[PDB]
Design a protein around this ligand. Structure first.
Ligand SMILES: [Mn+2]
Ligand SMILES: [Mn+2]
Ligand SMILES: [Mn+2]
Ligand SMILES: [Mn+2]
Lengths: 283, 285
């Protein structure tokens, strides 16, 4: 009726290495001392403090989705018994990500200031409609179509927000707050590659006919999400004046979202076009 | 409007906070523990004792696999607070760590083909397969309350038929690292039973006495059936080495803790003094 999981009889060699990489990257928000960033924080403007809350607020919401219904839908299309175990680690760390944003708020912000942020996220047109498209794919979509959405979310669209803490890290501002985002990106870079790898296995098993049919919907989704994100980026970054530098940051990460799935790069935006202080933050 | 961002500064149930804290603080991996140091005491065992160890862990491996894949998956869909789902993500991950940890024990102690022999038997066992069938059927079809009772009975009560062996050796100062990796599993499952059993009592006290007398009837009916089948699995293993009646004493004892977590009274009269003293030395050390 049921079969036991065996880590001596490996079916896919990547399942072992990814578990050994994701578990050994385990981290908690309670360890990192956020109180050391308050000296830098209080020397920011209202414009900058407002931006930061809306950024981390947006990421909180998108990491909530992945922990609740994202990886829960992804586990249904699992090949090996080990892969379901690796998705269990992944799903836990998504809850860690979601929580870590609230821990960052508990240092920097007050009671009312937090209620403001969550009131904004729960009512935001861009975010609520973005989760509406992504969660439709998790409930209704196929095995290959869901794996495409998760990679497009966390390896591409999530970098709309990540831009800001990385920018501060380059200038040596808010070193500990960015340290949380650092560890999220350390996890999320492996989240994309593993899904992209498994996507690649089932994609090759699909016949020539149905591959191009999926690629058609792949790029349709990619364009509609970038369409929606451009308006969201303008809302955040206009008054500070980075609107165009975040756009050349999104297209750079779209290329990686393609590359993990096993595709040719669509945009010509290189790593040099990206802000060098942000790119120094990455390094 | 469509979805909700989880806010940990807006906690609904205060035990979500503490259960997350405790379990995350109780994070661990099998790769840390040095199992090669127990090869000195492992090889000082007969075929009667060596064969019992693999059948025990392998049998539990089936049930830690059951929990990680479908068990916590079922429990997640009947969530009260957003934070509870997060706790269950942590729970489900640790259930996979428990499932893996057994493979690390087998790798050090046993050989390639010896591991194939153990896994082959556990997947074709008359007791374990039927035992898992009763539990998974509840997860797939049972209602939000019956699934909580089954997971508590599973890991708080009938898991300890297997835990009796490594706890016995730990009391004799034998198989220390093989005991610690099991010791850590019990530390996690002790908290799981309490948390799952607590959320059970919330939804249990919301029903009228009408539906409470029916569930309690379905509860003890499931208790005695799992106990009777466990007495078959106990006699299937422990009769040669001759600890059959001690495991039965240990099973009746931990059955009360599963009851106590779910908010019910202790059924059996078997206390800590009735259980083997060196096994109780293993739990308290
Ligand atoms: Mn994430
Ligand atoms: Mn992910
Ligand atoms: Mn377990
Ligand atoms: Mn459990």
């Amino acid at each position: 009726y049921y079969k036991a999981i065996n880590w001596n009889a490996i079916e896919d060699v990547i399942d072992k290495s990814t578990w050994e990489k994701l578990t050994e990257q385990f981290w908690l928000d309670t360890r990192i001392p956020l109180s050391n960033d308050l000296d830098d924080w209080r020397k920011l403007s209202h414009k900058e403090k407002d931006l930061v809350g809306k950024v981390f607020g947006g990421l909180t919401l998108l990491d909530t989705l992945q922990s609740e219904s994202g990886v829960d839908a992804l586990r249904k299309d699992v090949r090996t018994a080990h892969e379901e175990a690796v998705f269990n680690n992944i799903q836990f760390m998504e809850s860690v990500h979601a929580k870590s944003y609230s821990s960052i708020f508990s240092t920097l912000n007050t009671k009312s200031e937090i209620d403001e942020i969550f009131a904004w996220t729960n009512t935001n047109p861009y975010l609520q409609k973005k989760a509406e498209i992504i969660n439709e794919i998790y409930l209704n979509g196929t095995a290959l179509e869901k794996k495409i959405a998760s990679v497009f979310l966390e390896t591409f669209l999530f970098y709309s927000g990540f831009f800001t803490p990385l920018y501060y890290l380059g200038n040596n501002k808010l070193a500990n707050v960015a340290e949380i985002i650092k560890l999220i990106i350390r996890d999320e870079s492996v989240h994309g590659t593993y899904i992209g790898y498994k996507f690649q296995l089932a994609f090759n098993e699909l016949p020539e006919d149905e591959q191009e049919k999926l690629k058609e919907w792949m790029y349709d989704l990619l364009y509609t999400l970038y369409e929606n994100e451009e308006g969201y980026t303008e809302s955040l970054y206009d008054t500070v004046g980075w609107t165009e530098e975040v756009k050349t940051f999104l297209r750079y990460n779209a290329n990686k979202a393609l590359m993990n799935l096993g595709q040719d790069p669509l945009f010509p935006d290189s790593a040099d076009d990206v802000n060098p202080i942000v790119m120094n933050g990455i390094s």
